[PDB]
Structure 1
Amino acid sequence: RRGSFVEMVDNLRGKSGQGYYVEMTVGSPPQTLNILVDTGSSNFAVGAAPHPFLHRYYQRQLSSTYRDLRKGVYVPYTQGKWEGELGTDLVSIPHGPNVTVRANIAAITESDKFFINGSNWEGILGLAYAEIARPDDSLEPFFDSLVKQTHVPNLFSLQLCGAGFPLNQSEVLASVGGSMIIGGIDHSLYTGSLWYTPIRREWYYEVIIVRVEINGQDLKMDCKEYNYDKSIVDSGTTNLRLPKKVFEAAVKSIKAASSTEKFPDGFWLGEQLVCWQAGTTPWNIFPVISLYLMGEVTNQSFRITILPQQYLRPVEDVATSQDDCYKFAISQSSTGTVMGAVIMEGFYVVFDRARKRIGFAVSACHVHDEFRTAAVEGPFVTLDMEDCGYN
C-alpha cells in the first residue's frame, strides 16, 4: 500500500524494444551516463569512445579516480558484442541510494550490434552473478561491490513500465519508464501479494517453470522441456523467448485460440507488424498466457499470467499512420527460456539475492483492458518440481 523508496521510484526510462536505462555517474568529477539495466549479464561497461549511436561516453583521462587494470575483456551476448579495457573508478546513482562505491568498469573500445540508434543509453549494468562475468568470476560485478562496500540490503526490485502504444524519441526521453529500487521493495509499485520462486543457481537469475497454460489449457509438455537448457529472467531481452519445441507448441495453441483472425507467418515469426484501425485491436481474441513457477514450499507452485497487451509489442506503423500496430513478442530460442521485458512489464519483480529467490507481483503499471488483468496467483499443488530442472 505505501512503498517508501521515493527517491528511486520512477528513475527509469525506455521501452521493451530498446531497453530500460538508469542514470549513473562515473569518475571524478562525475561523468553522467545512461546505463541499460540488464539482469542477463554480469559486466558493467560503458562506451569509452565516439560512436554514431552515442551522444556521450566515458573519458578515463578526465577522471582523477580512474584506475587501469591493464587488461582487455571480450563480451558476447545472444545478440551483439563488444571489446573493451578493464579498470575501476568511483560510481554513483543520482536517483538511487546515496552512496558512492568503487566498481569494476569495462571501457568499451569496439563493439558490434551492441549500441542501438536512439535508445539513449551508453553503457550496460550487468546485474547478475560473478559466475557469468567476463573474463571470469574474479571480476566482481557492480551489485556485489555495492553491497560489500555499503549498507544497502542485498536486494533490488524492478518495475518496467510498457506504454501500450509506441513512443518517438522525444516521448521516451520525456516519459517515466519505470523504477529500479536498489536495496528494497516499494509497495506503491504493485497490487496483491508477492509470490516467490527459488533462484536455482546464482549465475543468470535462473528459475524453474513447472507448467504452461494458454487460456487455461495445459500446453501439456514434459516440464523439463520448459527449462530445456535453462530459464532466466532478463530485463535486457525484449521478448519472451521459448525453447524451440515449446515455442512451436505455444504458437500452435495461440494460433488456435485466436483463429477468428488469420495472420501471416511473418507475424508469428516476430518479423512483421500487424495493424488494426485506431482503437480496434481485438485484444479479446488473443489468449492469456500463464507460466507456473516452482514455489518456496515443497510441492507448491504459483502462476503468473500475462495478457496480449504484454506479448504484442507496440510499434509505429510503417506509414506512421493512425493505426494501432504491434509485433508478436514471443520467439524461439536454442538457449532456454528467457523471460524478457515484455513479460516483466506485467509485474513488479523482486530480485531477492539475500534469500536466493525472485518475487513476482502484479505491476501497478501493467497495461490491460476493462475485461482482464495480469495476475499472480497461488498456491497450487505440484509434485516433483525439481524434476523440471534441466541438468
Structure 2
Amino acid sequence: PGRRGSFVEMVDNLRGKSGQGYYVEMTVGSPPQTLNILVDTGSSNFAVGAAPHPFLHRYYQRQLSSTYRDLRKGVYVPYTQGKWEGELGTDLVSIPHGPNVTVRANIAAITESDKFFINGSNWEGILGLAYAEIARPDDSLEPFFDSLVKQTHVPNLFSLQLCGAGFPLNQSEVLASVGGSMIIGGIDHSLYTGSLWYTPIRREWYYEVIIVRVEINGQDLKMDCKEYNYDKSIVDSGTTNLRLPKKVFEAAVKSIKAASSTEKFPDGFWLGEQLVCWQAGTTPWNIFPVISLYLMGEVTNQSFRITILPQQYLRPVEDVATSQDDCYKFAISQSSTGTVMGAVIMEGFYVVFDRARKRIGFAVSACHVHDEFRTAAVEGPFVTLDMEDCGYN
C-alpha cells in the first residue's frame, strides 16, 4: 500500500545542518517571543539566550512576558563542546509548526556562556528532549516533553527526520532550505521508505540503546560487543559526529583506511580536523565502505542492522578558498563517554523516539543522500544471542 503523510502541519519544520545543529521555531512568553531552538535528544534542559551575545540576533526578554514566573534558582549545564549558566523560570511555550497547544514549561534563561552559541547558526536556544534523570540542576526540573505530555493530549512519542543536503550551505541557504521534520506526537509515513525496526531504550536517561555487532563493508569489526557500548550508546541529535569509544574508534578507522586504501588521506583527515577536496562531481564514494551497526531487537535473540554510506559519514564543508571542488570532513571521532549516534548518522534515517513503548525505531530516510549504486538500509532480522551481555554496567 501507498504510504500517506498524516502530519502535514509538522513536516518540513526544521532548518539547519549537521555541523551547526537542526532547529525548530518556538515561541515563549506573552506576547509570544519567537526564537529558533536547537533540537537535542542528548540533553534534558530547555534553555534560551536571555541576554545580549555577539552571536545572538535576538533573545528572551523576561521583563516583557506577563506569564513569566521566576524560580529564583541558578543552573549550570556543561556539554562536550560548550557550557552555559542561567536562571530558572517558567513561561508559556508554543511550537508554531507543531501541535496546536500551549504549555507552561521550565526555561533556563542563559545569562553567561562559553563556546555554546555558534556564529551564523540561526538558533538562540536548545530543547533537551531526553529524560529528567540527566536534567540540571537535578531530576526535579521537569523537561519540556514531559510537561507537554502531562498538560495536553499529545501522545508520548516524537520522531525526527534530519535532512543533510549532501553539499555545503551558507547562512542564507540554511535560512531558505528545509532541514527536516520533527513530528510531535506521531509518525509521518511520507518521511521514510521500507519498514520501521525498533530497538529497546535500555534505561530512560539519555536515549540509551545496545549495539551488538559492527561491520565495515560486511567485515565484522570482531570486538567483544561490550566495547561498542562502553560506557553507553546513545542516539543524539545535538552532536554532529558518529562518536565511538577510543578502542572501537581505533579499530574502525583501521578498517575504513584499509577499505579506502586506493587513496591515501592525511592523518589530519582521519582525526576529523582537516578537510579533503575533489574536483567538482568526482568524489570517489565507491572507494569508501558502508558501515553497519546492529542493534538489539524487541524480539528475544533478534537483532537488525542500520547501514550508512560515506554520503552520511563524510560531512560536506566549504573549501578554504570557496572553489568549485567538493570538500568534506570525516565525521567519525573518538569518545571517552561511549558511542554517540549523532546527526550525521541520523541523516540516513527517520528516527522514532517512542517513549510510550520505551523503544527507538529506525527506517531509511526519504531524504538521505546516496548515489545510483548504493543506499542506506535498515534490515532484519538476524539471530543474535546473549545481547543483554553487550550492555555495560
- Smaller-chain TM-score range? over 0.9
Residue equivalent to 1:39: 41
Mapped to 2, the partners of 1:362 and 1:177 lie a distance apart of: 16
For residues 80 and 361 of structure 2, what CA distance do their matches in structure 1 show? 25
RMSD: 0.3
Alignment partner of 2:280: what SS?
coil
Measured after TM superposition, the shift of residue 228 of structure 1 is 0.6
Query: In the TM superposition, what is the alpha-carbon distance from 1:347 to its structure 2 partner?
Result: 0.1
**Corresponding residue of 1:138:** 140
Q: 2:252 is matched with which residue: 246, 250, 253?
A: 250
The answer to whether structure 1 residue 189 and structure 2 residue 191 are counterparts is yes
Q: How far did 1:28 drift?
A: 0.1
Structure 2 partner of 1:353: 355
Cα shift at 1:3: 2.0
Say whether residues 1:220 and 2:222 are aligned partners.
yes
Distance across 1 between alignment mates of 2:282 and 2:172? 26
1:307-335 CA distances to partner (integer Å, 9 max, x unpaired)? 00000000001100000000000000000
Residue 81 of structure 1, aligned match among 70, 83, 93: 83
What is the SS of the residue equivalent to 1:204?
coil
CA distance in 1, matches of 2:28, 2:55: 20
**Displacement of 1:79 after TM fit?**
1.2
Identity among equivalent positions (%) equals: 100
State the SS of the aligned residue for 1:359.
strand
Name the SS for the 2:173 alignment partner: helix
Shift of 1:152: 0.2
**Residue 10 (structure 1) aligned with residue 35 (structure 2):** no
**Could you report, residue by residue, the CA deviation over 1:66-105 in whole angstroms, capped at 9, with x for unpaired residues?**
0000000000011100000000000000000000000000
What is the deviation of 1:244?
0.3
CA distances 1:25-56 after superposition (whole Å, capped 9, x unpaired): 00000000000000000000000000000000
How many angstroms does 1:155 deviate by? 0.2
1:221 & 1:176 partners in 2: Cα distance? 39
Cα distance between partner residues in 2 of 1:365 and 1:142:
28
Structure 2 CA distance for aligned equivalents of residues 168 and 230 of structure 1: 34
Q: Structure 1 CA distance, aligned partners of 2:148 and 2:336?
A: 34
CA shift at 1:278, angstroms?
Answer: 0.2
1:215-270 CA distances to partner (integer Å, 9 max, x unpaired)?
Answer: 00000000000001000000010000000000000000000000000000000000
Give the structure-2-normalised TM-score: 0.99
SS in 1 for 2:225: coil
What SS does structure 2 have at the residue aligned with 1:245?
helix
Residue 56 of structure 1: SS of its match in structure 2?
coil
What residue in structure 1 maps to residue 274 of structure 2? Answer: 272
TM-superposed CA distance for 1:120, in Å, is: 0.4
Cα distance in 2, alignment partners of residues 369 and 67 from structure 1: 52
Partners in 1 of 2:128 and 2:58 — Cα distance?
Answer: 20
How far is 1:148 from its partner? 0.1
CA distance in 2, matches of 1:68, 1:55: 24
Deviations 1:125-162 (A, max 9, x none): 00000000000000000000000000000000000000
The Cα shift of 1:163 comes to 0.2
Post-superposition Cα deviations, 1:171-206, rounded to whole Å, max 9, x if no partner, equal: 000000000000000000000000000000000000
Structure 2, gaps ≥5 residues long:
none
- Aligned partners of 1:114, 1:234: CA distance in 2, in Å? 17
Q: Matched residues in 2 for 1:335 and 1:136: separation?
A: 20
Runs of at least 4 residues off by over 2 Å: none
Residue 165 of structure 1, CA deviation: 0.2
Q: What is the rounded CA distance, in whole Å, between the counterparts of 1:167 and 1:73 in structure 2?
A: 34
Give the distance between the partners of 1:225 and 1:112, measured in 2 at CA: 32
1:321 aligns with 2:339: no
Does the residue aligned with 1:365 lie in a helix, a strand or coil?
coil
Cα distance in structure 1, aligned partners of 2:282 and 2:193: 28
Q: Distance in 2 between matches of 1:131 and 1:79?
A: 21
Residue of structure 2 equivalent to 1:125:
127
For 1:311-366, what per-residue CA distance to the aligned partner results, in whole angstroms no more than 9, with x for missing partners?
A: 00000011000000000000000000000000000000000000000000000000
Query: What CA distance in whole angstroms lies between the structure 1 residues aligned with 2:224 and 2:5?
Result: 39
Three-state SS of the structure 1 residue aligned to 2:333 is strand
How many residues were matched structurally? Answer: 391
Measured in 2, the distance between the counterparts of 1:155 and 1:384 equals 29
TM-score, normalised via structure 1 length: 1.00
Alpha-carbon distance in 1 for matches of 2:171, 2:273? 22
SS at match of 2:304: strand
Q: CA deviation at 1:112?
A: 0.4
Partner Cα separation in structure 2 for residue 170 and residue 297 of structure 1: 46
Q: Which runs of 5+ in 1 are unaligned?
A: none
3-state secondary structure, aligned to 2:90? strand
Instruction: State the distance in 1 between where 2:103 and 2:230 align.
Output: 38
Task: Work out the CA distance in 1 between the residues paired with 2:364 and 2:5.
Answer: 15
Could you tell me which of 372, 376, 380 is aligned with 1:370?
372
Q: Helix, strand or coil: the match of 1:13?
A: strand
Please give the alpha-carbon distance, in whole angstroms, between the structure 2 residues aligned to 1:32 and 1:265.
Answer: 44
SS of residue in 2 equivalent to 1:266 = helix
Q: Secondary structure at the match of 1:32?
A: strand
